[PDB]
């Protein structure tokens, strides 16, 4: 009965390459069961492996990233769906 | 030899009743092994009955809420320890 609803994330804006990075895709509201997905300038985050995605509850989904290096800059965006509705984030990741 | 570092974290601006919540205390930076530990309004985490604390991974520690009620509102603490120092970030859950 709820359309799903992402909480904002972000990147850490002083980044620096081997630092560690998380963002939660939080569906702050939505009737579960809820589908998490998960792309880099478009593109399936299957393809970059030095990135992990989980979901370990039926309400959010986590990104994660061990040590980040130059390769790792780009868009992130996840999108949630249920029976209902859809919702989507973006956030963009920046190394100075 | 690097002394821990949080990357901030923050609870949702538009929070009404009885919707979930997540906030992660990342270690962006610090050498493992990491020590993680939770106050609410200065009081230990363990009182609070409606509150899920995990560490997922040994470099971020998270912090859940089903169902947000009343009882929820206060500033919430996060401490990470390690061998060489410590670090500290505090976020606020306020329902307008
Ligand atoms: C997508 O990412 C590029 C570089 O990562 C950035 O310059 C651009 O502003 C982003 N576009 C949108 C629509 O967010
Ligand atoms: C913490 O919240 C209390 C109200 O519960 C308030 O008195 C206090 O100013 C807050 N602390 C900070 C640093 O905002």
Same mark, same amino acid.
């Given at each position: 009965?709820? @359309?799903?609803?992402?909480? +904002?994330?972000?990147?850490?804006?002083?980044?620096?390459?081997?630092?560690?990075?998380?963002?939660?895709?939080?569906?702050?509201? =939505?009737?579960? +069961?809820?589908?998490?997905?998960?792309?880099?300038? =478009?593109?399936?985050? /299957?393809?970059?492996?030095?990135?992990?995605?989980?979901? +370990?509850?039926?309400?959010?989904? @986590?990104?994660?990233?061990?040590?980040?290096?130059?390769?790792?800059? =780009?868009?992130?965006?996840?999108?949630?769906?249920?029976? @209902?509705?859809? /919702?989507?984030?973006?956030?963009?990741?920046?190394?100075?």
């Amino acid at each position: 009965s709820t @359309v799903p609803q992402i909480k +904002p994330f972000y990147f850490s804006t002083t980044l620096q390459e081997k630092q560690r990075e998380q963002i939660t895709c939080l569906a702050i509201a =939505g009737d579960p +069961p809820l589908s998490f997905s998960w792309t880099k300038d =478009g593109i399936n985050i /299957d393809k970059f492996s030095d990135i992990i995605v989980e979901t +370990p509850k039926n309400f959010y989904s @986590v990104l994660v990233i061990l040590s980040i290096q130059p390769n790792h800059i =780009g868009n992130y965006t996840c999108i949630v769906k249920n029976s @209902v509705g859809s /919702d989507s984030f973006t956030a963009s990741l920046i190394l100075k």
